[PDB]
C-alpha cells in the first residue's frame, strides 16, 4: 500500500495543518472576547451598582 498511503498520508496531513491554522486564529480571536463579555463588564457593574 506504499504507493498509496505515502500520497494520502501527505494529503491528510497537509489538510490538517491548514485547517487547524484556521481554528487557532479563531480561537485567539474569540477568548479575549469571551473574557470581556463575561468577566470584566459584569465585575465593573457589580462594583458599580451592587
Do not use: G, W
Not at 498520508?9 to 485547517?19: A, F, G, H, P
Not at 487547524?20 to 458599580?48: G, Q, W, Y
Amino acid at each position: 500500500m506504499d504507493p498509496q498511503l505515502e500520497r494520502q498520508v501527505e494529503t491528510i496531513r497537509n489538510l490538517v495543518d491548514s485547517y487547524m491554522a484556521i481554528v487557532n486564529k479563531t480561537v485567539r480571536d474569540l477568548m479575549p472576547k469571551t473574557i470581556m463579555h463575561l468577566m470584566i463588564n459584569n465585575t465593573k457593574e457589580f462594583i458599580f451598582s451592587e
